[PDB]
């Protein structure tokens, strides 16, 4: 109970060595700094970053998002129907396969 969350945004480009410009999930865009120990070679435009909620500094980069809808759509099939239960259209099945 001694930790706080961080806002999530997307980087657009860097002005100089210590200044980037990033866009949150919502509208507003900010000119922000970055952490000293963090690597600067991975911050290509389009990546997703996490910013502090009181100073808005680059802290960490993250992989691409996966929507919960797409996750649900990815795997939902408890059925186990095989080719023996379907008959009468042995040519269209070959055409599809």
């Amino acid at each position: 109970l001694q930790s706080v969350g961080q806002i999530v945004g997307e980087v657009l480009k860097q002005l100089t060595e210590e200044k980037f410009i990033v866009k949150a999930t919502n509208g507003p865009r900010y000119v922000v700094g970055c952490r000293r120990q963090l690597d600067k070679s991975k911050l290509k435009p389009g990546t997703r970053v996490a910013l502090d909620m009181t100073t808005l500094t680059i802290m960490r980069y993250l992989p691409r998002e996966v929507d919960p809808l797409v996750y649900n759509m990815s795997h939902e099939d408890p059925g186990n129907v095989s080719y023996s239960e379907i008959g009468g259209l042995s040519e269209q099945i070959r055409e599809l396969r």
């Binding site: 001694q2 930790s3 700094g33 952490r35 000293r36 502090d52 100073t55 500094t57 802290m59």
Partner: protein, 287 residues
Amino acid sequence: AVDTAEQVYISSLALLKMLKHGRAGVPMEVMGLMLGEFVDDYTVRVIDVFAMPQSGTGVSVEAVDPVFQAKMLDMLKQTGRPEMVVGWYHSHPGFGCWLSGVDINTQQSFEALSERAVAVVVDPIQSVKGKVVIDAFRLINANMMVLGHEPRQTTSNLGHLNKPSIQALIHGLNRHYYSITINYRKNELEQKMLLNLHKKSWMEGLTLQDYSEHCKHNESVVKEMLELAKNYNKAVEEEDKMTPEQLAIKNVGKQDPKRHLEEHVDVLMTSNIVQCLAAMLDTVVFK
């Protein structure tokens, strides 16, 4: 009781150490402890500071860790440095100067160990080429205020030279703690040593540059000079055909040759004169 004329004296090394340490860990609040002495009860001198290991995944560290502090204190003595601790310091990046809620409890321990400690707060990213932001505070108790009395009895007018910022007033400040004045002690030896920065060797002032890029640069400059010369008279002619109330706003989107040519003239004259003079004396310095 305590007075408003209390003074604190900070050396140069301590300032630079704490500034560098605070700037290194910008996104969080790093902390350390100072050391010095109390020559009297009006002025407190601090002579050296040292950082301390922190626990990550946060922005605050408890100061209770006796092993490291004891080891550093008993090891510094072996090479001089018989001084004792006088207080602690921590940095607020881009906020200002105040004491957060936990900070009162944090400084309560030092107050209990020694009733005349002090807390120093440095702002590492709000200072540029001077005007470093450093403040010093001490706590007060509310029971004495219940008695209808106020601390820091005033005996002179040198304690109220700086008006506090509005953000310090917004937080606790005078109803929870009081700030004290600050000063930097300077001597001639370190100041004379420190001014050697950016000084260049005697070789850099006798080289006379290549005689091939110089003519290219002059040729480049002359053409833009010509174009600005052509564009000057157009703006000269229409200087009064329009009312002067909107004259200033007329030059808000497009450049003006009058301001944009003087810099060309200046750089060109300087380069040519210095390049001539260098060769002039070099022709006779060597043989």
